């Protein structure tokens, strides 16, 4: 309870000192490629933040500098106060979520996405690097990862649509045995 009371005074302390850190924003495009004008309930054509990466201004995460630094939103609240096990790495929290979802997912594809993802959150090595690259290949290129492209449009996005386009006709051929049933109907119609 007193650990959660620390999170009360954390938002009103850390955001005064550290400040900044705009989030939910990519295509943060700097002095007048900026607008936010378009359109109720949907955003179409660029924006100036607000998703896409297009027109060559991709960011990992960036924040406002104004004319003078040390500025942030008055409402520094963002989160319900909740505490639990220690984490001091982003990838350590990611692994904990993967393992929590394991042991209650059925064998086959639902459990198999977690296993590949487990390799992906794990680090490189000599050996460990191969398992991470096996996940990098399968997850990102098939388009089941569905990245937000923060620094990824290098060799990944390149092979991504090529692998996605290879995936679709291969599934049609595997359903070819079910086309045998359609073949009976195709004979009856054509014979008429």
């Amino acid at each position: 309870l007193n650990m959660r009371a620390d999170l009360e005074t954390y938002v009103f302390q850390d955001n005064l000192a550290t400040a900044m850190r705009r989030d939910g924003e990519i295509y943060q495009s700097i002095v007048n490629d900026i607008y936010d004008v378009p359109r109720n309930v949907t955003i179409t054509l660029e924006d100036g933040s607000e998703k896409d990466v297009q027109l060559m201004a991709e960011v990992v995460d960036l924040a406002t500098g104004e004319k003078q630094v040390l500025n942030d939103i008055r409402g520094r609240y963002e989160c319900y106060t909740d505490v639990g096990p220690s984490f001091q790495s982003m990838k350590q929290q990611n692994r904990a979520e993967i393992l929590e979802l394991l042991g209650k997912t059925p064998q086959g594809t639902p459990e198999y996405q977690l296993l590949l993802l487990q390799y992906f959150t794990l680090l490189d090595g000599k050996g460990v690097e191969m398992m991470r690259d096996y996940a990098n290949k399968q997850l990102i290129q098939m388009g089941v990862k569905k990245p937000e492209t923060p620094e990824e449009q290098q060799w990944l996005v390149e092979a991504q649509q090529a692998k996605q386009g290879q995936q679709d006709p291969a599934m049609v051929q595997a359903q070819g045995v079910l086309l045998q049933g359609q073949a009976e109907l195709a004979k009856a119609q054509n014979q008429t």
């Binding site: 650990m3 938002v11 009103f12 302390q13 550290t18 400040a19 002095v31 900026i34 008055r74 639990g84």
Partner: protein, 337 residues
């Protein structure tokens, strides 16, 4: 504030909080004797046998080990109906500057004293450091408040446990001479002076460090709020966002330059000003600390109130009765043998 004329408001609130620093604090270090040092209390150096037993120390070490092996740290979770990546924002900046081991040490100190003395605490401080910067070369560090047994003065006249609504609370820091010189670098105090507060350390004057400097920082509540002027972002998109103006006092001029908007606004802020005061006179008055709530959140063991007074005890309070008694009978029969 409680009163007008701020120095009187501090010192009079200290009077009401003297219940903790006199009687309770005296009994709090006696827990730490039976645990850390020697079984007897106010013993003498003798040429005759003085016993020990202590089932208490194996029990304390067992209980301390449970809370350390299951540490409780900041995790965050989204608000009501909020986006799932909300938590990762504040955790991103938390894990960078808490990379330093001074954060993890403070968690392990807080849980051990909570069991033993019934109190424990930690503070959050902000400084300029670039051995793990987040943004703007400003970081937040968790510094341990250690020796909560003899640092208790804090008292709440509210029935809350959080102590982030208090204005009668104060913590004391008993440090050595070299530590007083480092404490004066940050808070702009005197490097050497040797202030004494009310001294809630010695009573029977046992074994203690040669240099003892009692300095007490207080946390008051002065609202100060903020008002007026909507601002804009010509940097990183999404213009027309409300930004602070009375929290900042330098940045505000250049924030009105290049872009400006007005539509007014009123936001009520409850801010805490850390004043460092001694009983004789205020040493430094009304330093604005980065926190707008009290960064010192004490953990309590068994806890409650008498009436309008915090009362707390650890697990070692009642054992002082039995342990000294066990030793008396033991030490007498040593003479017979």
């Amino acid at each position: 504030e409680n009163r007008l004329e701020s120095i009187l408001s501090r010192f009079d609130a200290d009077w009401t909080a003297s219940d903790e620093a006199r009687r309770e604090a005296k009994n709090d270090l006696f827990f730490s004797r039976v645990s850390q040092w020697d079984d007897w209390l106010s013993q003498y150096t003798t040429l005759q046998y003085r016993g020990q037993f202590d089932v208490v120390r194996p029990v304390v070490r067992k209980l301390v080990s449970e809370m350390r092996q299951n540490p409780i740290d900041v995790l965050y979770r989204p608000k009501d109906g909020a986006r799932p990546d909300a938590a990762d924002v504040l955790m991103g900046m938390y894990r960078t500057d808490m990379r330093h081991n001074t954060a993890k040490i403070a968690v392990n100190i807080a849980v051990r004293e909570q069991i033993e003395a019934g109190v424990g605490a930690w503070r959050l401080v902000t400084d300029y450091e670039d051995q793990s910067p987040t943004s703007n070369n400003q970081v937040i560090r968790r510094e341990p408040i250690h020796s909560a047994c003899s640092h208790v003065i804090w008292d709440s006249n509210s029935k809350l446990m959080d102590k982030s609504d208090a204005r009668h609370c104060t913590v004391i820091h008993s440090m050595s001479q070299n530590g007083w010189e480092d404490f004066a670098e940050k808070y702009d105090l005197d490097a050497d002076d040797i202030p004494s507060f009310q001294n809630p350390n010695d009573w029977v004057f046992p074994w203690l460090t040669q240099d003892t400097i009692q300095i007490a920082e207080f946390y008051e509540v002065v609202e100060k709020k903020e008002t007026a002027f909507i601002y804009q972002d010509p940097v990183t998109g999404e213009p027309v966002s409300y930004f602070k103006r009375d929290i900042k006092d330098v940045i505000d001029d250049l924030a009105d330059s290049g872009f400006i908007k007005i539509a007014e606004r009123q936001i009520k802020r409850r801010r805490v000003y850390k004043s460092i005061i001694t009983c004789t006179a205020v040493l430094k008055d009304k330093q604005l600390i980065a926190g707008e709530h009290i960064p010192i959140v004490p953990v309590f063991g068994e806890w409650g109130f008498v009436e309008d007074k915090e009362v707390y005890e650890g697990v070692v309070r009642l054992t002082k009765d039995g342990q000294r008694l066990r030793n008396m009978i033991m030490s007498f029969n040593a003479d017979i043998v």
